[model samples]
Target: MAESDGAEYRCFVGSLSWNTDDRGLEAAFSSFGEILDAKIINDRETGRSRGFGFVSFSNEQAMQDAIEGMNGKELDGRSIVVNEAQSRGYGG
Candidate 1:
């Protein structure tokens, strides 16, 4: 199974309030699983949140649980969008 293979599942978080940060995101998703990592993308110039972030889980099931449990839940008074992380295609 995917879980036994040491595969990691990444979730994309978006629509976050300007006040939301890495710590808040971590705290919100912690109940769903053991988060391997979490991050809130920030603007390089303004040094502020970009309204999006990612959460990583070592186990696929845990990741799935997080997606089902937290996706659409309110965080920082904003409804967060959670789902599997998608890759950006190269070559224009």
Candidate 2:
């Protein structure tokens, strides 16, 4: 939901390595609840992982579970960084 800063809390995930795409990320988190979105950040030219990506859940409980369950977990040999994303806004 909304943080004290008045911006919404988001789960900005990273450290995901291969075979898993947006669908995979969505599918992986679906067990918790509805997902807002999932995306892999790719290089504009290389078409490869920037070694990071994001998964957004529309619900709070699910997002918490996602952070607790996925953080430091391994995928394709790299551990993940799952946490509340910061707002990119004024006074940030």
Candidate 3:
């Protein structure tokens, strides 16, 4: 297994209301730490929200803090799920 130094982390955010956008995502999680990247998944054709998103952090502590602090929190009137991201497909 690879060792983690707590420097880079990616988190999954789900159950987002259709209205939540990138700026709102950053605004909600910025206080946890510096956000390296944040984005709401969009439908390729419709350009509508997919009801989920991802947030990357420069520090693992920040990622952990965000997961603990924001999970189950309401955003755009929808409760969101937060967790360490799982690989989506083949390859590490």
Candidate 4:
């Protein structure tokens, strides 16, 4: 998805794997809850991860589960970073 989609999350996140694609990101966090959506952002021209991404769970519980389980943890050989996703297109 494009940055124009208007994400409905609550926190800004960063420091993800450079190679992590949407599926890798999804699989890495699905256990925490039903993944509402997962996005491994990339440079518009290079098509690479910007070393960060965003996730939105089906509900708050799932979101919390991911934040709690993955925060400060490691995945794909990189220290995992988890946090609340920010709502895009809301003047932030």
Candidate 5:
């Protein structure tokens, strides 16, 4: 079995408000540290927000700090859940 090593500095941000977008997600986590990327997942079929997203940081510390600092914190007028991200396959 191949040992997978990924998501070193990425976080899963959930429970996001419908109004939150990519920029808004980045803005909230930017204070933690240098972010490599920030994205808000959208429903491909309906073109609507998915109420969740991901943020990748330049370092693990930043990712960890963001998870601790932003979990249950308000963003776009709604509380959000932040934690380490898990890898997944795209499509079947």
Candidate 6:
């Protein structure tokens, strides 16, 4: 059987409210598993939330669970979308 091999699991979180911050994002997903990191993308010029962020987990299961459990769920009164993170690059 496959076992944990210290893989890095992450999920892309989107549709966040302007009020949601890193701590809030972490708090929202903390119940699902151990979060390694939670970050919100901010506008470089405005320094405001861009309505999206990323959450990293220590294991794949936690990431998957968060995606399944949190997708389309409300965060900070706004519906959020959760999915496996993709590479940061142009379209393949």
State each candidate's clash count.
0, 0, 0, 4, 0, 0
Name model 3 segments beyond 4 Å from true: 1-7
Error of 6 at 76 (Å): 0.7
Pairs of residues at least 3 apart in sequence or in different chains that clash in candidate 4: 10-85, 11-85, 11-86, 16-51
Model 3 clash pairs? Answer: none
Cα-based TM-score, every candidate: 0.75, 0.71, 0.77, 0.69, 0.77, 0.77
Model 2 spans with C-alpha error above 4 angstroms: 1-6, 88-91
Give the winner by TM-score: 2 or 4: 2
Two-way lDDT contest, 1 vs 4, winner:
1
Q: Of the candidates shown, which would achieve the greatest TM-score relative to the real structure?
A: 6
Model 1 RMSD to the real structure?
3.8
Stretches of candidate 6 exceeding 4 Å from the true structure = 1-7, 89-92
- Relative to the true structure, candidate 6 has a C-alpha RMSD (angstroms) of 3.8
Candidate 2 residues 1-92, lDDT tens each?
34454454456666665455677667667899887677677776876777666676666788886777786777655567776664642246
lDDT of each candidate versus the true structure: 0.72, 0.67, 0.73, 0.62, 0.71, 0.73
Off by over 4 Å in 4: 1-15, 87-89
lDDT by residue for model 1 over 1-92, one digit each (tens)?
A: 55422344776888665677778888877777777788778777997768887887756677786777775788888887877663431112
Window of ten residues with lowest summed lDDT in model 2: 1-10
Regions more than 4 Å wrong, model 1: 1-7, 89-92
Clashing pairs in 6: none
Report the lDDT tens digits of candidate 4 across residue range 1-92. 33333544433346566655667767876776676666666777985668776767656666665676666776666776666646443556
User: Which structure is stronger by TM-score: 1 or 5?
Assistant: 5
Compose the digit string of candidate 3's lDDT tens values, residues 1-92: 34243324877788666667767878888888888888777777986778887888767688876787886898777788887764541126
Residue 43 local lDDT, model 6: 79
